Scaffold this active site. Structure first.
Site, PDB file in Angstrom:
ATOM      1  N   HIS A 274      44.745  36.633  38.236  1.00  0.00           N
ATOM      2  CA  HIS A 274      44.210  37.789  38.950  1.00  0.00           C
ATOM      3  C   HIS A 274      45.330  38.595  39.627  1.00  0.00           C
ATOM      4  O   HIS A 274      46.485  38.166  39.653  1.00  0.00           O
ATOM      5  CB  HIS A 274      43.077  37.390  39.930  1.00  0.00           C
ATOM      6  CG  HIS A 274      43.522  36.657  41.159  1.00  0.00           C
ATOM      7  ND1 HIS A 274      43.908  35.334  41.151  1.00  0.00           N
ATOM      8  CD2 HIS A 274      43.560  37.048  42.457  1.00  0.00           C
ATOM      9  CE1 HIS A 274      44.159  34.939  42.388  1.00  0.00           C
ATOM     10  NE2 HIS A 274      43.954  35.962  43.197  1.00  0.00           N
TER      11      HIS A 274
ATOM     12  N   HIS B 195      46.671  39.301  42.621  1.00  0.00           N
ATOM     13  CA  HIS B 195      47.009  38.981  44.003  1.00  0.00           C
ATOM     14  C   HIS B 195      48.445  38.471  43.963  1.00  0.00           C
ATOM     15  O   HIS B 195      48.894  37.972  42.929  1.00  0.00           O
ATOM     16  CB  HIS B 195      46.065  37.911  44.559  1.00  0.00           C
ATOM     17  CG  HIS B 195      44.861  38.471  45.252  1.00  0.00           C
ATOM     18  ND1 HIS B 195      43.795  37.687  45.641  1.00  0.00           N
ATOM     19  CD2 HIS B 195      44.562  39.734  45.644  1.00  0.00           C
ATOM     20  CE1 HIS B 195      42.892  38.445  46.243  1.00  0.00           C
ATOM     21  NE2 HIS B 195      43.334  39.690  46.256  1.00  0.00           N
TER      22      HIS B 195
ATOM     23  N   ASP C  88      49.987  35.819  45.059  1.00  0.00           N
ATOM     24  CA  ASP C  88      50.217  34.425  44.677  1.00  0.00           C
ATOM     25  C   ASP C  88      50.093  34.160  43.165  1.00  0.00           C
ATOM     26  O   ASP C  88      50.409  33.069  42.695  1.00  0.00           O
ATOM     27  CB  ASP C  88      49.280  33.495  45.478  1.00  0.00           C
ATOM     28  CG  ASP C  88      47.788  33.723  45.177  1.00  0.00           C
ATOM     29  OD1 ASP C  88      47.376  34.879  44.929  1.00  0.00           O
ATOM     30  OD2 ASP C  88      47.016  32.735  45.214  1.00  0.00           O
TER      31      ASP C  88
ATOM     32  N   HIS D  67      36.123  35.504  43.456  1.00  0.00           N
ATOM     33  CA  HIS D  67      37.202  35.609  44.429  1.00  0.00           C
ATOM     34  C   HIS D  67      37.743  37.049  44.416  1.00  0.00           C
ATOM     35  O   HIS D  67      38.081  37.617  45.461  1.00  0.00           O
ATOM     36  CB  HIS D  67      38.310  34.627  44.064  1.00  0.00           C
ATOM     37  CG  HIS D  67      39.559  34.823  44.851  1.00  0.00           C
ATOM     38  ND1 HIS D  67      39.636  34.579  46.204  1.00  0.00           N
ATOM     39  CD2 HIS D  67      40.779  35.291  44.488  1.00  0.00           C
ATOM     40  CE1 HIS D  67      40.841  34.890  46.641  1.00  0.00           C
ATOM     41  NE2 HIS D  67      41.553  35.327  45.615  1.00  0.00           N
TER      42      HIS D  67
ATOM     43  N   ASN E 109      40.403  35.115  51.462  1.00  0.00           N
ATOM     44  CA  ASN E 109      40.273  36.568  51.506  1.00  0.00           C
ATOM     45  C   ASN E 109      39.056  36.997  50.709  1.00  0.00           C
ATOM     46  O   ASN E 109      39.022  36.830  49.500  1.00  0.00           O
ATOM     47  CB  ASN E 109      41.512  37.228  50.893  1.00  0.00           C
ATOM     48  CG  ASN E 109      41.451  38.740  50.940  1.00  0.00           C
ATOM     49  OD1 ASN E 109      40.375  39.329  50.977  1.00  0.00           O
ATOM     50  ND2 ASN E 109      42.612  39.379  50.922  1.00  0.00           N
TER      51      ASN E 109
HETATM   52 ZN   LIG Z   1      43.672  35.782  45.245  1.00  0.00          ZN
END
Ligand SMILES: [Zn+2]
Length: 216
Positions: free
Chosen positions: A75, A77, A79, A138, A169
């Site tokens: 995804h 993000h 990380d 998520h 989040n």
């Molecule tokens: Zn994430």
């Protein structure tokens, strides 16, 4: 078997013969996979940023004496796609769904390939990999990775670890749809052995039920 960098912010531990789990601290730990194949190293997700990502790549290439040829971005993000710049200048292919690719550009990250479809099967050497888009959870673009020869599921951030009481989040999350998305994963893969959460230690399908419980 666990190998770490001098600082302690990066470790790689073996799940079995050709599958290892890499973890980087950002102090929040983040998981990903390192697949050792007869034709190079394949990773599932990069790291928080370019320094940690380059450093992770350097370790695994040194240890296996091979190049990292592909990476699967779960995804958009930090990380997961934090070191996309590192990957592109090393000629590493960054696989991602089209959605993840546009969301990455939207977040000011260089764009991944956007080649993965809802269900995609990749085979690197003798290592089989399947990516699956279960739906929004998520994040709007989150996907899971399945290794059919080991029955290992990389639920990523769609799955929370056993001691986690927080969903994380959810500013970008689809809380209500999240549950249906986990159900799709459960209906798709009936015999799951190990499942790797995005943060935390490797568990089993109980982690998905745990997450659905947090979502209720
Ligand atoms: Zn994430």
């Amino acid at each position: 078997t666990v190998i770490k960098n001098e600082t302690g912010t990066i470790s790689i531990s073996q799940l079995n013969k050709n599958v290892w789990v890499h973890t980087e601290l950002g102090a929040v730990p983040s998981n990903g996979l390192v697949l050792n194949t007869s034709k190079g190293l394949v990773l599932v997700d990069s790291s928080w940023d370019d320094k940690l990502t380059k450093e992770l790549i350097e370790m695994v290439e040194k240890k296996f004496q091979k190049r990292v040829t592909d990476v699967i971005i779960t995804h958009a993000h930090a990380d997961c796609i934090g070191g996309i710049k590192t990957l592109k200048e090393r000629g590493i292919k960054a696989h991602s769904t089209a959605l993840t690719a546009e969301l990455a550009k939207k977040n000011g990250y260089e764009e991944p390939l956007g080649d993965l479809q809802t269900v995609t099967n990749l085979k690197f050497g003798n290592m089989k990999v399947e990516t699956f888009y279960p739906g929004k959870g998520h994040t709007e673009d989150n996907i899971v990775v399945w290794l059919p020869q080991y029955n290992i599921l990389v639920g990523g951030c769609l799955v929370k670890s056993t001691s986690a009481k927080d969903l994380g989040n959810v500013a970008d999350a689809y809380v209500n749809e999240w549950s249906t998305s986990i159900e799709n994963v459960l209906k798709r893969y009936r015999n799951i052995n190990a499942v790797v959460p995005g943060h935390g230690e490797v568990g089993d399908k109980g982690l998905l039920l745990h997450t659905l419980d947090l979502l209720k």
